[PDB]
Design a protein around this nucleic acid. Sequence first.
DNA 1: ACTATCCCCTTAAGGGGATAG
DNA 2: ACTATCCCCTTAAGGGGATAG
Lengths: 71, 71, 414, 414
Amino acid sequence: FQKIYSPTQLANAMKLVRQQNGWTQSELAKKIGIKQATISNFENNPDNTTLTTFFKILQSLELSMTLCDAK
Amino acid sequence: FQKIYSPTQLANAMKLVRQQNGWTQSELAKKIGIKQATISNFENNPDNTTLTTFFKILQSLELSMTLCDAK
Amino acid sequence: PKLVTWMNNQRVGELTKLANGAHTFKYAPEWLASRYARPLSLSLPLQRGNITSDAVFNFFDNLLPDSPIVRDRIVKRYHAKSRQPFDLLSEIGRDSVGAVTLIPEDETVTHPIMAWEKLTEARLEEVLTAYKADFRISVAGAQEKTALLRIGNDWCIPKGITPTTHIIKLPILSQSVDNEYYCLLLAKELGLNVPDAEIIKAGNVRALAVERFDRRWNAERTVLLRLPQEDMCQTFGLPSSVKYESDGGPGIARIMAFLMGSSEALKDRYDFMKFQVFQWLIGATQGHAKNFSVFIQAGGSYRLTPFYDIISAFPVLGGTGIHISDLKLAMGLNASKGKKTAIDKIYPRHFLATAKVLRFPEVQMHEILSDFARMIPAALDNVKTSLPTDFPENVVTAVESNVLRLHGRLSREY
Amino acid sequence: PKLVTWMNNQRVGELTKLANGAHTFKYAPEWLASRYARPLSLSLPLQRGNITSDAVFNFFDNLLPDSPIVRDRIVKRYHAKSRQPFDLLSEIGRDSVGAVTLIPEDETVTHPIMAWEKLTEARLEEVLTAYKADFRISVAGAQEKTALLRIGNDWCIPKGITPTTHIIKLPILSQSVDNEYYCLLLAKELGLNVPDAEIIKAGNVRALAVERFDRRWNAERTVLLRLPQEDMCQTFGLPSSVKYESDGGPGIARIMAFLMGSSEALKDRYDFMKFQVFQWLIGATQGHAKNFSVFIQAGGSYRLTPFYDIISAFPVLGGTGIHISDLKLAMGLNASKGKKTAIDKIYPRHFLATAKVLRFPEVQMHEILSDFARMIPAALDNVKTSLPTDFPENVVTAVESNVLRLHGRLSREY
DNA sequence: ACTATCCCCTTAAGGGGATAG
DNA sequence: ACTATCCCCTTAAGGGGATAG
């Protein structure tokens, strides 16, 4: 798939997936036990976002991640 | 490749790669502009680690990440 | 002499016991690169050097029985050089729980991969009754239990590194075998993920036969595969001496947070909490860390394994000192005043209070309680109309009776 | 009428100008799922709805020339309904910088994909001299410039949505064409990533022909492809009115941090800083945000593009008011007292001070200065012995002379 | 040599709780 | 309906700087 190199490229991607799946920041946040504000921060200011936060949101999107070379 | 679902699975993986490539926390930290302590924290306590930090370390390992389904 | 650690005939690494008696482990470079590569235990993440932390010792120690008395029974049988984990494991290291096969460095001695001895109804009666007063297995847990290989229609004993398919439990509780056989049937009836168990009758002895979920035949049906796994003591690198939360073991929060990193995180978290309620309803008080396990998958992924070792402490009341007010859940719930654990004092508001702090969807905690509220009744019936003709009705009634007592606390709200 | 945005004959989306005059953009669902999918601009991340933020307006506005006077020259030529970005783009929206092709909604009018008119040495002399007193292109930048298609051995003019291969610049600075032709040759000689440019002579006019790095022929050689890209004003969703840092544009820190997210991050960061030094050595003061670009790759990846639009302000000293002490770098460096930008006051310790705050490897800043210290001399020579027989020696000497003056500041330490 | 800590200090994540557009 | 903010409050990331094992 597409290789990602920054917090921003990440959030843009994840936010696209949430929109393509019709989910709101609220339903996902309830499922994973975090505040809706947290999801919002993540989408607009991913730089200083925690990794557990990131993985909880990754789980709520029914997604996963993988490492690879940057060629 | 192997799907990752948490900060810890992530750090274990990334730390393996650093060791398999013979790098130290110091040489990588200098290259990406962060403190060696930061790399150490990341390897042992990835939960509350920033995403930029995570991507800077990802770049220093000559790696990249990608999203995917968890099946 | 180093202990070579194998996992389905794949060299993972070696266990070393230094002169100073320090246990160390080192992953085999070939394993670090293997397709099947994964840590032996999450407490021992894949890395290059010699691992020297206590997790190494604790991990392997957790493969052997808890009772220091039982270990003696092992040093006795297979003449061990000590009750030390390493020395013992050098004797019965073959069929250990999970999927590790510890074989001494100096001992290729290619053991039969698929071999077994079709036991007679007498030999079985001998082996069963045996555990009370080639067979190199290792079952860890709270009580006394062995393990057999079921093939065709005969209970056979493995020979070599051949795996077993069933964990067999013997009567200790006066009918622990019947207590668990019931708790399991009921667990299934309520949609909880549990192993199908059966009761084997050999002459006079009565034993429980649980199908193992850490065993699977390959596609060809030519090889019985061991699925890697570890309990919550291992996962956290803790000594079995702290398996209970009151002693220092992990609780709901610890486990729940860890489950967030599961491949099936949202489902496992739901299932784990659901089970906290089931344990309450059937007065099960053995829900300690070594009773929950995760499967270790290629790359380091894990997901919760089926629940097992379930027994109700209900049949042990009245006639003796033991009373419903003396039953406490191994893992506490959140209460207004600190934490609660007394079954007979526990109420829905407690599970909801716990969910509140853990931040587990409130709506799902409501749905869990709700589902039980309306399913217990029908569940007991189907289970009951399943109990063999010769099943101790005092077990059925004691369990069934107290379940409804607690259940009422639910239906009264849901 | 909406403007359909194409990218190499692939529908990316549409630009809409509402009644209230609000510019909006909406990605085409088909594009969001495309293999080639990527945002038009990092300031406009792929999403489902109508994008209404100012980044939409600023992005497209940044495709047109900076000078409000020039835009008039456009409204004049292709009779535009306004100097408004949308109206103008509806006229010359075909060959815009980067790789977008804006064609009105009501206008499939399949335009020739590969078409051109082999110009004569006279027609060329006409078009060149023209820009001073089918051709629907759009070159953005600081000065007046057009763009042609080079094929075989003839300068041809594109016809339709056919791409161009060269950015042609005309003499404004009295010999801007020669100033840049030199700065580029020198840049290459020093290992900096820059486009190969040449000087085209048509009758009396003398023009610069820069090969475009945002253009590439497909494997078949049957199609000229536009490579997506954007400058630093666009990347950050800023108006060209703030392209300089002193006005409000991005500086070293901003750019450097952003480069950390490059596919070639470590190399790009090194290259960007290296260029900050080169700009210093050749007294280039045009290093504003719209002079740095990143290529946009499938999925949203980006990497720094080659440097371009390089001119030395050295040839403009002495004889006039302008003096070396009046030359300031567009992007400031870190100084003891705030920040420094005066070329003639800048010293190695400044680049090292900047590197210190940005946390760019100190050792690499040392190696950059070091490499220049010992390479400039040889570099000037090879470049010089390359300058065509008819090259203004006042340009060569003015540049060469002042380079050594600053260079000495280096060799003196490295 | 390499990694884990440790003090100082500023900035801010994220949970509570809750509302303006 | 959905997302961005906002106040309060505790915890700690990560840069400086630097050392114990």
